[PDB]
Amino acid sequence: AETTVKIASDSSYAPFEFQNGQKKWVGIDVDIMQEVAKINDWKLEMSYPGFDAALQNLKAGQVDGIIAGMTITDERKETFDFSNPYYTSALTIATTKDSKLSDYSDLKGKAVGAKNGTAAQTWLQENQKKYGYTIKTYSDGVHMFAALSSGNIAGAMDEVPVISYAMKQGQDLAMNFPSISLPGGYGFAVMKGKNSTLVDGFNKALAEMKSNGDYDKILKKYGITA
């Protein structure tokens, strides 16, 4: 019967992987992986220990691959082989829907938020002298978006898919600023030199899903492009 495939992911990264109201695992990565497995006649066993644990479990041979919004980078290619990117994310500034701010130049003298430890934070730091905002740093999304709604930041930098999902959820957000592409894209990962069948299967199924409408339907479920 079917070949079993163990894939580990993050424990909370909406809209890529997260638990719904019924505690069921959903998200872009979940839906993509489930369909990749269906197309390839694989018996999928998903686990959600968190990204760092997933990497540990993958190196230890405890799982066969990872899908967890994992950026493809030259350094990571020293340890992992990747699929083609199945999504390429981007950063932008979220505002309330009533805000007129829309240009990175409009930020002079204003407070802009980001979550600690993220690419958004780094981009803000890199471009602060360029654009002249002040940076407020938040522990997590709930706190950052509460500051935006309270008017204590004029904008909140985050990922386009994360803001899109929040907008789909009905949060008071708009994306009026340009997007800053996050190079590399997200890929399915296996250990370098191992499991090429999984990578090839992923790539083939991805191309099929893009071509047949299923990929677009998945992204739209979570509010993306859209």
Tab-separated table of C-alpha atoms in Angstrom, residues 1-7 33 36-45 64 195 197-198:
chain	number	residue	atom	x	y	z
A	1	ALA	CA	0.000	0.000	0.000
A	2	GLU	CA	0.867	3.722	0.057
A	3	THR	CA	4.305	5.054	1.007
A	4	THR	CA	4.273	6.848	4.333
A	5	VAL	CA	5.699	10.367	4.446
A	6	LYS	CA	6.363	12.188	7.714
A	7	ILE	CA	6.404	15.984	7.420
A	33	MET	CA	1.078	19.297	1.481
A	36	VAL	CA	0.782	17.020	-2.910
A	37	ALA	CA	0.423	13.776	-0.970
A	38	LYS	CA	-2.895	12.940	-2.612
A	39	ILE	CA	-1.488	13.552	-6.130
A	40	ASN	CA	1.508	11.367	-5.313
A	41	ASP	CA	-0.388	8.577	-3.513
A	42	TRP	CA	1.502	9.230	-0.273
A	43	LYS	CA	0.154	8.520	3.208
A	44	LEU	CA	0.913	11.838	4.885
A	45	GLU	CA	1.750	12.074	8.591
A	64	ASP	CA	11.252	13.008	6.103
A	195	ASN	CA	14.562	11.921	-0.505
A	197	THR	CA	11.561	11.449	-4.779
A	198	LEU	CA	9.769	13.677	-2.230
